[PDB]
Design a protein around this ligand. Structure first.
Ligand SMILES: O=c1[nH]c(=O)n(Cc2cn([C@@H]3O[C@@H](CO)[C@H](O)[C@H]3O)nn2)cc1F
Length: 124
């Protein structure tokens, strides 16, 4: 079975590309990471940094999570990311997404031993 840490990697890690993300990126990636299986997942962010760099965020700036929990951490440096946002004309099973590349600080929730990211909270 898939751990929460593995699910975070599946949903949010894309170290293989720098940012290059074509206009096609989200359409392809949302499908290939299985985020369009039961529905069109409305919003999702991929991080283009090393797993080590993202894991390191769990010992960086402690900040409040959007849900009010206290286990969120904001990266000290900006990171290359791609936001995927479902288009208005997207209809399941043919999920369509607008691909937006950016460089922003990420905020992730961390849990467990070892203490690793389990949720992507926000980018600022
Ligand atoms: O800028 C964002 N980018 C973004 O990807 N999200 C959603 C998200 C949360 N999660 C966490 O992991 C999922 C594992 O099931 C949960 O829905 C959530 O805790 N995954 N995607 C929210 C943002 F504001």
């Amino acid at each position: 079975k898939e751990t929460a840490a593995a699910k975070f990697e599946r949903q949010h890690m894309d170290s293989s590309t720098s940012a290059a993300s074509s206009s096609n990126y989200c359409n392809q990636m949302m499908k290939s990471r299985n985020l369009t299986k039961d529905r069109c997942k409305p919003v999702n962010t991929f991080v283009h940094e090393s797993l080590a760099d993202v894991q390191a965020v769990c010992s960086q700036k402690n900040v409040a999570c959007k849900n009010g929990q206290t286990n969120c951490y904001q990266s000290y440096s900006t990171m290359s990311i791609t936001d995927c946002r479902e288009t208005g004309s997207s209809k399941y099973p043919n999920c369509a997404y607008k691909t937006t590349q950016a460089n922003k600080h990420i905020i992730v929730a961390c849990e467990g031993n070892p203490y690793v990211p389990v949720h992507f909270d926000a980018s600022v």
